[PDB]
Amino acid sequence: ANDGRQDIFSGAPQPNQHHTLVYGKSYHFTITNGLPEFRHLATTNSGYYAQQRFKHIHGIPWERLLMYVSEGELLRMFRDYTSLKVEEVVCEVYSLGVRLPFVTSATTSSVANANAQYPIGCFHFDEAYETNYGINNVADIINKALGTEWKNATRPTAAVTTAWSEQFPNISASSTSRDINNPVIVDYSLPYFENNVPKDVGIYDYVDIKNGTTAYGKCWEKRFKPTNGLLYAESTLKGNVVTPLAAQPTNIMTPIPGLENGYFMSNDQIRERRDLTTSVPPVALTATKLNQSASNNLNAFVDYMGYNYFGEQKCAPQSMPKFMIGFVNIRNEDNSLLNAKWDILIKTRIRLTGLQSTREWVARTDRIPPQYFTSQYTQFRYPNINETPLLRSLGTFKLPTKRPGMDSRIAA
Amino acid sequence: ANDGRQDIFSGAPQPNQHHTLVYGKSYHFTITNGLPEFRHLATTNSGYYAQQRFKHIHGIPWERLLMYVSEGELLRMFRDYTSLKVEEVVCEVYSLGVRLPFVTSATTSSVANANAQYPIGCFHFDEAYETNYGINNVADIINKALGTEWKNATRPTAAVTTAWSEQFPNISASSTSRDINNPVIVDYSLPYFENNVPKDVGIYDYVDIKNGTTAYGKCWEKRFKPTNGLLYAESTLKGNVVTPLAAQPTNIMTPIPGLENGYFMSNDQIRERRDLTTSVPPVALTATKLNQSASNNLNAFVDYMGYNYFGEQKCAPQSMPKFMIGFVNIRNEDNSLLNAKWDILIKTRIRLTGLQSTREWVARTDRIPPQYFTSQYTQFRYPNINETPLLRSLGTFKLPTKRPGMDSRIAA
Amino acid sequence: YVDIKNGTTAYGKCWEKRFKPTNGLLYAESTLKGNVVTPLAAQPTNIMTPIPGLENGYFMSNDQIRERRDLTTSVPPVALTATKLNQSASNNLNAFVDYMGYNYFGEQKCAPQSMPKFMIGFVNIRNEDNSLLNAKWDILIKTRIRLTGLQSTREWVARTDRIPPQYFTSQYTQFRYPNINETPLLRSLGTFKLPTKRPGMDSRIAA
Amino acid sequence: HGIPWERLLMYVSEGELLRMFRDYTSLKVEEVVCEVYSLGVRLPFVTSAT
Amino acid sequence: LQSTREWVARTDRIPPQYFTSQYTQFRYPNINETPLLRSLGTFKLPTKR
Amino acid sequence: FSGAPQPNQHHTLVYGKSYHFTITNGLPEFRHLATTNSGYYAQQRFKHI
């Protein structure tokens, strides 16, 4: 008790930064009927699949970060932190009615009848069968969500007044109704010469139907709190995007948990590292941001991006449920399809958490401080840190065990 | 009550972003004795001042943002937000003793005596007389605080091993004791030919003395919650640092409060806009970040930077108190000065609040969203938005009414 | 990162550090090797049963994480059944208290976070000419240690002075090489603290 | 400076180490303690080259 | 168990536990190779396996 | 309307048998076994157990 032996000064570092971001958008889309269709798909490496596309069941790409954030806001939040995690995403769907013509006219047709009581519903058979979307289909929905600029932010040499025009090369769906088409596709793998095949998915065992005419307003709302919302993380000393390692591995090495067994879900089956001979299998190494290209960041997914925490099992979590909504096709007397147009409003909300490891790292440059010493984030990439990391399949694949399909764009 | 007349959908924008930053540093400095000295200063525009410098009273530049944040952390926080405000700054001073030699040796002198009971204190006459620091003196303290890098972040062509060396071109005071010298200067303006002058400041009417030998540890702690901690704010549509206006003022104009009367504290007297004929007087216009240069940002002050809120009186607040500490000179038998060396430890803490006006502005580029429509921040600059704004005097001047001295680097 | 005291008045007990190692394993014998010189005589057969393992082949190679296949300079260790006949007499002398490369059968085979370094020192005072004010500090150090020895005599009645191995019911493991006579993964004498706060170790087996 | 309290030889002598290293099937450290006492920090009143 | 929930078979072939989850066995990349068999001699190896 | 798939099947089987065996004495015996891959083992067979 103050015997001249007690501490006089007691230091402590500054804290790490913890920022929380909240963004959101609202859109007005329109979707339409479509009869089911099938085909068989052949791919490289002798891949063969039986495909069934439901042109009347569309999927909202709520897995895409760009559905909540604009390209500008994405660029910023992608450079501001050491690591960025998605805390929660919400997507609400409002129905403004399902209309169709009173009389079909080859020329002057008009969708004036809103009292057809067309059946609409929320499909969710993506939890029992392999599903995916078309790459361009989703790309389209996002381009219409963001829309392309038309204002002359940069004055023309002759900044003269122009004529009014409704011809928006690509106006955002946040300003007006815009058509989108993203039919869900169900795959039935045929890896063997003689395969065991199931009966076509019974969509009626996975749907909640509502009356298209009376269901006016809030219809569905999906929430998702990702287990691994890691969009990115920096834990390397690489202070450039171009520089390669200079030093080779030494004899200094200490055993760490790892928690990566080299097992992957290669389409329909489980494969071990050594068997993936077509493309080079990724490996859980110390994470970096300088691996992803600008265009890759734009296609960021909210549930999993290939990054993991040091103490967790290095692997992909079960992908968030697909948000599929659609019609329940009514057919005419001649069995043809009774076409209808559905107007919906979508609200999107997202909460993220940014971290800046400034506690054990006082930077004297604009370079983001890495989560280096105390702990390290990891990502599925290659010993050559400049090689493209394990990317996320844009087709939003749902592989057996409900995990997100990913590509290994590094040819072996 | 649900008579088919109630709202079906109710939209709302995303929120603005509100981030809070917390940084801090610790330093080890050493200061020494100094007899008081005087001189008369002549400056352009026939300026004449009587100056008295107390070489034994040093000031901690806790007004400087770089005392809390490193150049790297400053760069980042200066580009990340629409506006950044200082919430609070804290500065603690610990004493490790006041030593001096047992016997003065012209050659092998040693500061081995810590039992001289040298008087030390916290001076605060900066609240009664004009005070300021030397530009290079403060610049020096900050360079030693930050220190310059010595690690070869970028490998030499011949990355060979070098010899150990204690010769750090400029090691940070955060790693070792470093000498600093920042004597406080008291000005006695002499604007007229025959001036009314006061007796030299009685420093003993503004000091709290402690026993240098027994005062070991925490001695002083200063806190400051700035009324206007505005480091910067963007409210213009200028999307570049180079572009000038293209459009001239029109006839469209609506009266706003303004709250700027064109009155300045020109040194010792109050002057109205029209009388400041040497340099062009600033004017409270809509704020920008693209006005300040990279080097200006580095010299950012925590209490006032020239930015203000739309609804407040456009002017500078009373500058935060100077943090001046020093010795109470003991003299030898021959009246010479008894030299002593004081070792102190400084802790600095700072809390800031960043804003990103994303509610009424969805950006599609990395350009920071401006606080444009709902309200606008303002700053003391010139109709020509590219002209250097009203800058903060590096000499940390305290003008009558206790306001920070500022420069109008735009020659008239 | 410092707690300062007054060198003149702080006379006596100043600091005390305690550490209860999670893996204080200095060594463990679980092999049937009854010699220090003998090599295996039998090669692996087709008899093999899957065990947990709990070793993923990941190491902290200095500043980064590396997988077994990338450590091409030196041969990466592997968690095999432990032995004492691997360590030399001089190695034993340099034994570390927190981790020596041995692990329990049911735990994740890896190094724990190394015990905190016990660093004490001065806060340099400088003379008027900025030179260093030299000082000499006299300290007294007390050290205490408690260990637990095991002798697996329950399922093994030895008729020689050879220590009974923890063979059947369970087996200890250590980071060494298929060639049981190769020097095991050694502990860096420089007492390195690698990212994630783990002890630096050497793989003295050239590849 | 750092006290090598990570080193077993800081607690046990080479002789005691030799024995405990041959006596068991396995040996585990349960706990290590290290106390530091200060007897003062001294220096010359006047620096003399000799 | 008969995984008939996510698989309506139109043949006598047993429905596989395919999508929601998958069972695993110690065998070889060549699915037709004999899997890891059980020693008929009923061996008890160290660790009692 | 709210659809849902059929369940998976879960069947429980219960079987059992009874036997009448006879066993006899036997002195202990030993040998050494050599196998491929240079395998060598000391064996002790208890003919009464």
PDB file of N, CA and C in Angstrom, chain F:
ATOM      1  N   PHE F   1     -52.177 -22.006 -49.921  1.00  0.00           N
ATOM      2  CA  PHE F   1     -51.672 -23.363 -50.017  1.00  0.00           C
ATOM      3  C   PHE F   1     -50.249 -23.348 -49.488  1.00  0.00           C
ATOM      4  N   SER F   2     -49.863 -24.418 -48.805  1.00  0.00           N
ATOM      5  CA  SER F   2     -48.519 -24.523 -48.261  1.00  0.00           C
ATOM      6  C   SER F   2     -48.045 -25.968 -48.413  1.00  0.00           C
ATOM      7  N   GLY F   3     -47.187 -26.201 -49.401  1.00  0.00           N
ATOM      8  CA  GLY F   3     -46.694 -27.542 -49.656  1.00  0.00           C
ATOM      9  C   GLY F   3     -45.578 -28.013 -48.749  1.00  0.00           C
ATOM     10  N   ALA F   4     -45.339 -29.322 -48.785  1.00  0.00           N
ATOM     11  CA  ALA F   4     -44.303 -29.971 -47.991  1.00  0.00           C
ATOM     12  C   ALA F   4     -44.081 -31.380 -48.546  1.00  0.00           C
ATOM     13  N   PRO F   5     -42.815 -31.821 -48.635  1.00  0.00           N
ATOM     14  CA  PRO F   5     -42.455 -33.147 -49.150  1.00  0.00           C
ATOM     15  C   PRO F   5     -42.896 -34.280 -48.229  1.00  0.00           C
ATOM     16  N   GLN F   6     -42.779 -35.511 -48.718  1.00  0.00           N
ATOM     17  CA  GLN F   6     -43.120 -36.678 -47.916  1.00  0.00           C
ATOM     18  C   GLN F   6     -41.918 -36.893 -47.004  1.00  0.00           C
ATOM     19  N   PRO F   7     -42.089 -37.653 -45.914  1.00  0.00           N
ATOM     20  CA  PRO F   7     -40.984 -37.903 -44.982  1.00  0.00           C
ATOM     21  C   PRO F   7     -39.988 -38.933 -45.501  1.00  0.00           C
ATOM     22  N   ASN F   8     -38.880 -39.088 -44.788  1.00  0.00           N
ATOM     23  CA  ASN F   8     -37.911 -40.110 -45.150  1.00  0.00           C
ATOM     24  C   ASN F   8     -38.467 -41.305 -44.397  1.00  0.00           C
ATOM     25  N   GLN F   9     -38.077 -42.510 -44.782  1.00  0.00           N
ATOM     26  CA  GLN F   9     -38.574 -43.677 -44.077  1.00  0.00           C
ATOM     27  C   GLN F   9     -37.589 -44.047 -42.979  1.00  0.00           C
ATOM     28  N   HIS F  10     -38.122 -44.443 -41.830  1.00  0.00           N
ATOM     29  CA  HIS F  10     -37.300 -44.839 -40.699  1.00  0.00           C
ATOM     30  C   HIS F  10     -37.850 -46.148 -40.167  1.00  0.00           C
ATOM     31  N   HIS F  11     -37.158 -47.244 -40.456  1.00  0.00           N
ATOM     32  CA  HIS F  11     -37.594 -48.553 -39.998  1.00  0.00           C
ATOM     33  C   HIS F  11     -36.651 -49.097 -38.946  1.00  0.00           C
ATOM     34  N   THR F  12     -37.195 -49.857 -38.010  1.00  0.00           N
ATOM     35  CA  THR F  12     -36.379 -50.448 -36.968  1.00  0.00           C
ATOM     36  C   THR F  12     -36.505 -51.966 -37.044  1.00  0.00           C
ATOM     37  N   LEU F  13     -35.364 -52.647 -37.082  1.00  0.00           N
ATOM     38  CA  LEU F  13     -35.340 -54.099 -37.172  1.00  0.00           C
ATOM     39  C   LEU F  13     -34.841 -54.719 -35.875  1.00  0.00           C
ATOM     40  N   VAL F  14     -35.434 -55.849 -35.505  1.00  0.00           N
ATOM     41  CA  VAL F  14     -35.051 -56.557 -34.293  1.00  0.00           C
ATOM     42  C   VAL F  14     -34.939 -58.049 -34.587  1.00  0.00           C
ATOM     43  N   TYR F  15     -33.723 -58.573 -34.467  1.00  0.00           N
ATOM     44  CA  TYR F  15     -33.453 -59.980 -34.724  1.00  0.00           C
ATOM     45  C   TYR F  15     -32.707 -60.609 -33.552  1.00  0.00           C
ATOM     46  N   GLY F  16     -32.613 -61.934 -33.559  1.00  0.00           N
ATOM     47  CA  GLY F  16     -31.921 -62.623 -32.486  1.00  0.00           C
ATOM     48  C   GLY F  16     -31.875 -64.128 -32.667  1.00  0.00           C
ATOM     49  N   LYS F  17     -30.838 -64.748 -32.112  1.00  0.00           N
ATOM     50  CA  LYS F  17     -30.647 -66.191 -32.202  1.00  0.00           C
ATOM     51  C   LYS F  17     -30.159 -66.769 -30.879  1.00  0.00           C
ATOM     52  N   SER F  18     -30.200 -68.092 -30.768  1.00  0.00           N
ATOM     53  CA  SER F  18     -29.724 -68.784 -29.572  1.00  0.00           C
ATOM     54  C   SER F  18     -28.915 -69.981 -30.063  1.00  0.00           C
ATOM     55  N   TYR F  19     -27.772 -70.231 -29.435  1.00  0.00           N
ATOM     56  CA  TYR F  19     -26.916 -71.336 -29.846  1.00  0.00           C
ATOM     57  C   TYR F  19     -26.452 -72.174 -28.667  1.00  0.00           C
ATOM     58  N   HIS F  20     -26.009 -73.389 -28.973  1.00  0.00           N
ATOM     59  CA  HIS F  20     -25.485 -74.299 -27.970  1.00  0.00           C
ATOM     60  C   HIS F  20     -24.103 -74.726 -28.453  1.00  0.00           C
ATOM     61  N   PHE F  21     -23.070 -74.228 -27.781  1.00  0.00           N
ATOM     62  CA  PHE F  21     -21.694 -74.550 -28.139  1.00  0.00           C
ATOM     63  C   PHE F  21     -20.988 -75.287 -27.011  1.00  0.00           C
ATOM     64  N   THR F  22     -19.858 -75.901 -27.345  1.00  0.00           N
ATOM     65  CA  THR F  22     -19.041 -76.623 -26.377  1.00  0.00           C
ATOM     66  C   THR F  22     -17.589 -76.246 -26.641  1.00  0.00           C
ATOM     67  N   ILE F  23     -16.850 -75.960 -25.575  1.00  0.00           N
ATOM     68  CA  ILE F  23     -15.448 -75.587 -25.699  1.00  0.00           C
ATOM     69  C   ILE F  23     -14.617 -76.399 -24.717  1.00  0.00           C
ATOM     70  N   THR F  24     -13.313 -76.491 -24.961  1.00  0.00           N
ATOM     71  CA  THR F  24     -12.447 -77.269 -24.083  1.00  0.00           C
ATOM     72  C   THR F  24     -11.121 -76.624 -23.697  1.00  0.00           C
ATOM     73  N   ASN F  25     -10.431 -77.297 -22.779  1.00  0.00           N
ATOM     74  CA  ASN F  25      -9.133 -76.892 -22.264  1.00  0.00           C
ATOM     75  C   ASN F  25      -8.093 -76.723 -23.353  1.00  0.00           C
ATOM     76  N   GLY F  26      -6.943 -76.196 -22.953  1.00  0.00           N
ATOM     77  CA  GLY F  26      -5.852 -75.988 -23.877  1.00  0.00           C
ATOM     78  C   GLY F  26      -4.720 -75.292 -23.159  1.00  0.00           C
ATOM     79  N   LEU F  27      -3.514 -75.826 -23.295  1.00  0.00           N
ATOM     80  CA  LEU F  27      -2.347 -75.233 -22.664  1.00  0.00           C
ATOM     81  C   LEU F  27      -1.901 -74.036 -23.508  1.00  0.00           C
ATOM     82  N   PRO F  28      -1.214 -73.063 -22.896  1.00  0.00           N
ATOM     83  CA  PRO F  28      -0.759 -71.897 -23.659  1.00  0.00           C
ATOM     84  C   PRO F  28       0.412 -72.279 -24.559  1.00  0.00           C
ATOM     85  N   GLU F  29       0.517 -71.627 -25.711  1.00  0.00           N
ATOM     86  CA  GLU F  29       1.608 -71.906 -26.631  1.00  0.00           C
ATOM     87  C   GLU F  29       2.105 -70.617 -27.268  1.00  0.00           C
ATOM     88  N   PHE F  30       3.340 -70.636 -27.755  1.00  0.00           N
ATOM     89  CA  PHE F  30       3.935 -69.455 -28.366  1.00  0.00           C
ATOM     90  C   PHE F  30       4.649 -69.760 -29.671  1.00  0.00           C
ATOM     91  N   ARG F  31       4.922 -68.703 -30.424  1.00  0.00           N
ATOM     92  CA  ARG F  31       5.619 -68.805 -31.698  1.00  0.00           C
ATOM     93  C   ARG F  31       5.989 -67.395 -32.116  1.00  0.00           C
ATOM     94  N   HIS F  32       6.713 -67.288 -33.219  1.00  0.00           N
ATOM     95  CA  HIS F  32       7.104 -65.996 -33.752  1.00  0.00           C
ATOM     96  C   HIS F  32       6.569 -65.983 -35.170  1.00  0.00           C
ATOM     97  N   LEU F  33       5.957 -64.872 -35.560  1.00  0.00           N
ATOM     98  CA  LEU F  33       5.365 -64.764 -36.884  1.00  0.00           C
ATOM     99  C   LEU F  33       6.103 -63.789 -37.783  1.00  0.00           C
ATOM    100  N   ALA F  34       6.449 -64.251 -38.978  1.00  0.00           N
ATOM    101  CA  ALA F  34       7.127 -63.411 -39.949  1.00  0.00           C
ATOM    102  C   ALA F  34       6.111 -63.156 -41.056  1.00  0.00           C
ATOM    103  N   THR F  35       6.032 -61.920 -41.532  1.00  0.00           N
ATOM    104  CA  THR F  35       5.085 -61.580 -42.589  1.00  0.00           C
ATOM    105  C   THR F  35       5.741 -60.718 -43.659  1.00  0.00           C
ATOM    106  N   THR F  36       5.033 -60.499 -44.760  1.00  0.00           N
ATOM    107  CA  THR F  36       5.573 -59.678 -45.834  1.00  0.00           C
ATOM    108  C   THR F  36       5.890 -58.292 -45.283  1.00  0.00           C
ATOM    109  N   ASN F  37       6.767 -57.572 -45.975  1.00  0.00           N
ATOM    110  CA  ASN F  37       7.175 -56.239 -45.548  1.00  0.00           C
ATOM    111  C   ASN F  37       8.006 -56.323 -44.273  1.00  0.00           C
ATOM    112  N   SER F  38       8.695 -57.448 -44.104  1.00  0.00           N
ATOM    113  CA  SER F  38       9.557 -57.675 -42.950  1.00  0.00           C
ATOM    114  C   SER F  38       8.850 -57.619 -41.601  1.00  0.00           C
ATOM    115  N   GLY F  39       7.562 -57.950 -41.585  1.00  0.00           N
ATOM    116  CA  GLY F  39       6.823 -57.941 -40.337  1.00  0.00           C
ATOM    117  C   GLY F  39       7.265 -59.074 -39.431  1.00  0.00           C
ATOM    118  N   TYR F  40       7.446 -58.776 -38.149  1.00  0.00           N
ATOM    119  CA  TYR F  40       7.863 -59.785 -37.181  1.00  0.00           C
ATOM    120  C   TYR F  40       7.079 -59.564 -35.896  1.00  0.00           C
ATOM    121  N   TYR F  41       6.466 -60.628 -35.388  1.00  0.00           N
ATOM    122  CA  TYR F  41       5.659 -60.534 -34.178  1.00  0.00           C
ATOM    123  C   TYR F  41       5.865 -61.732 -33.266  1.00  0.00           C
ATOM    124  N   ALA F  42       5.760 -61.493 -31.964  1.00  0.00           N
ATOM    125  CA  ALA F  42       5.877 -62.560 -30.983  1.00  0.00           C
ATOM    126  C   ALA F  42       4.424 -62.863 -30.648  1.00  0.00           C
ATOM    127  N   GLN F  43       4.018 -64.116 -30.796  1.00  0.00           N
ATOM    128  CA  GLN F  43       2.635 -64.478 -30.521  1.00  0.00           C
ATOM    129  C   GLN F  43       2.454 -65.486 -29.405  1.00  0.00           C
ATOM    130  N   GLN F  44       1.397 -65.288 -28.628  1.00  0.00           N
ATOM    131  CA  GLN F  44       1.083 -66.172 -27.519  1.00  0.00           C
ATOM    132  C   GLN F  44      -0.399 -66.508 -27.588  1.00  0.00           C
ATOM    133  N   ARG F  45      -0.702 -67.775 -27.856  1.00  0.00           N
ATOM    134  CA  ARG F  45      -2.084 -68.219 -27.971  1.00  0.00           C
ATOM    135  C   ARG F  45      -2.570 -69.001 -26.760  1.00  0.00           C
ATOM    136  N   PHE F  46      -3.676 -68.544 -26.184  1.00  0.00           N
ATOM    137  CA  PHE F  46      -4.264 -69.185 -25.017  1.00  0.00           C
ATOM    138  C   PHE F  46      -5.379 -70.123 -25.457  1.00  0.00           C
ATOM    139  N   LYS F  47      -5.020 -71.389 -25.640  1.00  0.00           N
ATOM    140  CA  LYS F  47      -5.961 -72.406 -26.085  1.00  0.00           C
ATOM    141  C   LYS F  47      -7.080 -72.733 -25.107  1.00  0.00           C
ATOM    142  N   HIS F  48      -7.088 -72.070 -23.954  1.00  0.00           N
ATOM    143  CA  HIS F  48      -8.126 -72.309 -22.961  1.00  0.00           C
ATOM    144  C   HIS F  48      -9.020 -71.082 -22.793  1.00  0.00           C
ATOM    145  N   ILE F  49      -8.745 -70.046 -23.583  1.00  0.00           N
ATOM    146  CA  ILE F  49      -9.526 -68.810 -23.554  1.00  0.00           C
ATOM    147  C   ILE F  49     -10.101 -68.586 -24.949  1.00  0.00           C
TER     148      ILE F  49
END
